[PDB]
């Protein structure tokens, strides 16, 4: 045929979980290949990241030739940063495919049973989550999208701007306003509010079963998502008022 529409092709979690052969369900343990250090290469930042090659190369290892844990993480955080809420959801489906499949040979396999050290990533991957969810649009409008953030430091700002009036220009400068993310909101359609909040409860879903899995199979080494819950319940309660005011039932 020819080039399929869009940046990455579909990702596919049947692919993604099936064991690589019979005798080595999840492969070797690629970390010394050319293959993994271009993947982080590619992810390092101050130098830009390169997220799309993230997404394939980390998704084409994971389809072919290994399971790991490392990989799965960081391809999360590539369709993240790539695709929005609805990427960061698939890697939390994969993450809890892969720990529901292959616990006993996902590299990197257990020393001493330090099953902590071993999900490292994954207690990374929480504090990151919460980064990311704050940075989802909740609005697309008036030439900019605002998020979370943005409506928290417009906050900010106002009330900086009351405390101290005559730097209102420089605290102004370079941050959103209230007045502009209203303005911002109130051009943006019922249909990025309706899929919002859809993708933002398919989100907490994939949360909800990830960390299931991970109380069965961790216990008391489990890493914690109370950073990644408590700001999706921010973003979530946030997205819900600017749909309403907008319209949307
Ligand atoms: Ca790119
Ligand atoms: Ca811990």
Redesign the pocket.
Known sequence: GLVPRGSHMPINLPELLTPISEASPSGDDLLFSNEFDAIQDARRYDKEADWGFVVDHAGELLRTRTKDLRLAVWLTEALALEDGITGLTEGYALLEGLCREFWDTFHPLPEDDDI?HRLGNV?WLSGRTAELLRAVPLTDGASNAFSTLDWEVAQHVAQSIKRDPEHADDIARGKPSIEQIDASRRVTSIAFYTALLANLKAFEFALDAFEERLVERAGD?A??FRQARDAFETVYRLAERFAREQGYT
């Open positions: 902590e207690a080494s890493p914690s």
